[PDB]
Amino acid sequence: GETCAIPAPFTRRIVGRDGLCVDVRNGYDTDGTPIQLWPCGTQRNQQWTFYNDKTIRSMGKCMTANGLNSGSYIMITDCSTAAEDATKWEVLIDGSIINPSSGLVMTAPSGASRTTLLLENNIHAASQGWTVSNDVQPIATLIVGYNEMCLQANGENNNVWMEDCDVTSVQQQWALFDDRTIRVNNSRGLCVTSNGYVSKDLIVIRKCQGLATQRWFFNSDGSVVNLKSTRVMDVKESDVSLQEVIIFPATGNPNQQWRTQVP
C-alpha cells in the first residue's frame, strides 16, 4: 500500500458561536494571555497552525489549558515549558475541540464578544461547536427531505414542516453555522432548536443559546441528528401532511434522509 504523507503545518481560523472566531486577547503573544471570542478578521491573534503533535498554536505559542479541571480557561504559552498533556488537542467531526487527556472540550459560555473561553464538561451543546477554516462565513443552502420537498421555517416557537421547495423564498433558506447550529438565513438569531431528547419530540425554531438540542451533526449517511442523543431529525410517520418534524432513532428510511442543496 502507501501510508499518507505526514501533513505539514497548516494555518486556519476557528469559529464556533454566533459566528465568532477564537482570538488571543489583545493579540499579545506573551505567555498566559487568555483565549476568548472576537469578530473574525485579518489578524495574527486569530490564525492557528496545526501540527502532528496535535498542538494548535497561534503567534508561535501552543494553545494550552491553563488548568486541568472543569472550569479552567484556555490561553497560550511557550510550547517548551507548558505541560505536554495540556497542549494537545483533537478536532472531531462533531465540531468538538476535545483534549485527549483531561477529556474536556473547548466551551463558549456565551456568544457575547470578549467571552473568555474555558474547558468545560463535554455535554454536547451548541456551545462546544467549533469549525476550523479560513472561511468564517456560514453556508447558505436548502434542505430537501421527503417527497423532494424542502424543510421550511415559519415563525418563532413554531414547528418546522416540509413545503414545496421554493428557492426564491427566504422561509426555506438556511445558514449552517460553524458552531454546528442551523439558523434561519434571514434572522440568523434563531436556531433550529429541538424540544427534548426522547424520540417523538417536535422540532421548532427558537432563539440560539448554545443549547444541546440545537446541536446538529450532518451524518455522512445523509441523516441530520443531534449530538446528545442518537435521535434523528425526520418527518413523522413519513407523512409530510402532519406538518411535524421530530427526533427519532436512526431507522435508515428515506424520511430520515436530508440534503443541503447550496443556496
Binding site: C4, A5, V91, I93, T131, V132, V144, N219, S220
Partner: protein, 254 residues
C-alpha cells in the same frame, strides 16, 4: 463471468426510483473493509478479483430500448457499453476488461478514451453545454443504441449515473429534473466538485477518520465562478455531499 447489474427504467420512473437505483449501483462497489467518517474507500486493482472488478448498468429509455454500461468497481469509471449485441470500448481500454466484458457481442473500439478532457474533445463541445435530465438521458441512450455511441451521449450518462452516486449533490439535481420533467446544465459548482474527486479523495484519507480539518484544500467553485476553497470535511459534504471515496492512500494514525 456473470457480472451483476443495476437497472433503471426511464419508463415513467419517479425520483424515488432514481435514489434507489443509485443506492444499488453504490452498494455494488461499496463492498469493502475501509471507511472514513462514513464514506467508503473503493477497493483497488491490487485487491480486486477479475470476477468482481466490474458492474453493469442497464439504462432503458422511454422507447423500451436498453443500454448496459460497465462501471469499474475501483474508480467507478465507465469502461464500455453495449446495445443490440454491440459493445464499444475506448482507445486504451485495458485488455483486462474486453477479455470478460460483454463476452459474446460484436466488439468495437472508439477513436477516443474515457475522460472529460477527451470526451469533450471528441464532440466539439464542453460539459457546460451538454444538458442533462430525463429527456436528454433518453436521447443520449438512443444515440448510443442507434448511432453506435459518440462522446456527447456518454457525457450525459457519466454525470447522470456514476458521478451521480459519487456526489449526492448531482443526484438531487437530476432528481429535481426527473420529477419535474425538466432539464439543466452543469454549473460552475457541480462541474468543479466533479473535477476534484481524486483531490478531495486524499484530503479525507489524509486527515484521517473523525478528523475534520484538511491538510490541504480543494479549489471548488460557486455558481458565480467565485473560488470556494474547502478545507474541512463537514464544509465539503454539506456542499458536494460526497458518498464515495477513491483510494488515494491508507490511514497512518493507526
Amino acid at each position: 463471468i456473470d457480472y451483476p447489474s443495476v437497472s433503471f427504467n426511464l419508463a415513467g420512473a419517479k425520483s424515488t426510483t432514481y435514489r434507489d437505483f443509485l443506492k444499488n449501483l453504490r452498494d455494488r462497489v461499496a463492498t469493502g473493509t475501509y471507511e472514513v467518517n462514513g464514506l467508503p474507500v473503493l477497493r483497488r486493482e491490487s485487491e480486486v478479483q477479475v470476477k468482481n472488478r466490474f458492474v453493469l448498468v442497464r439504462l432503458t429509455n422511454y422507447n423500451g430500448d436498453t443500454v448496459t454500461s460497465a462501471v469499474d468497481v475501483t474508480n467507478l469509471y465507465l469502461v464500455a457499453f453495449s446495445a443490440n449485441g454491440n459493445s464499444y470500448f475506448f482507445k486504451d481500454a485495458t485488455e483486462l476488461q474486453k477479455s470478460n466484458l460483454f463476452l459474446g457481442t460484436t466488439q468495437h473500439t472508439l477513436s477516443f478514451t474515457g475522460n472529460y478532457d477527451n470526451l469533450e474533445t471528441a464532440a466539439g463541445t464542453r460539459r457546460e453545454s451538454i444538458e442533462l435530465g430525463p429527456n436528454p438521458l433518453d436521447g443520449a441512450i438512443t444515440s448510443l443504441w442507434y448511432d453506435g455511441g459518440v462522446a456527447r451521449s456518454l457525457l450525459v450518462l457519466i454525470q447522470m449515473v456514476p458521478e451521480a452516486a459519487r456526489f449526492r449533490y448531482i443526484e438531487q439535481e437530476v432528481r429535481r429534473s426527473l420529477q419535474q420533467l425538466t432539464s439543466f446544465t452543469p454549473n460552475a459548482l457541480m462541474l468543479s466538485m466533479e473535477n476534484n474527486w481524486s483531490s478531495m479523495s486524499l484530503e479525507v484519507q489524509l486527515s484521517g477518520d473523525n478528523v475534520s480539518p484538511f491538510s490541504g484544500t480543494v479549489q471548488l467553485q460557486n455558481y458565480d465562478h467565485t473560488p470556494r476553497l474547502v478545507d474541512n470535511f463537514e464544509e465539503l459534504y454539506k456542499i458536494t455531499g460526497i458518498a464515495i471515496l477513491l483510494f488515494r492512500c491508507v490511514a497512518t494514525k493507526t
